Amino acid sequence: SLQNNQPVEFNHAINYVNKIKNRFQGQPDIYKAFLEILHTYQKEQRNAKEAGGNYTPALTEQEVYAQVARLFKNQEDLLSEFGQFLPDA
């Protein structure tokens, strides 16, 4: 809860999630997996902090895009939008 700016970044991913959520309407595995994919990445950052410093993360945008790319097989379009948030994959 700090001084944020330009809600385009947030709204961008937000509306993007809608495409995904809608596209994978009958795919709870995709929506759940996709979130866990990102969360796996975010958690590892947290992990390093909890360890005190002597801990390297077990994920990167590479793991994120990796698992996501599997979900968006016949929907390469949604994937194109994804990379705009993370280009390290």
Binding site: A13, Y16, L86
Partner: peptide
């Protein structure tokens, strides 16, 4: 970083 978490939080919101 905001990126992923910024987008993840979205789902929880769009879900409702």
């Amino acid at each position: 970083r905001m990126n992923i978490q910024m987008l993840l939080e979205a789902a929880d919101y769009l879900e409702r």
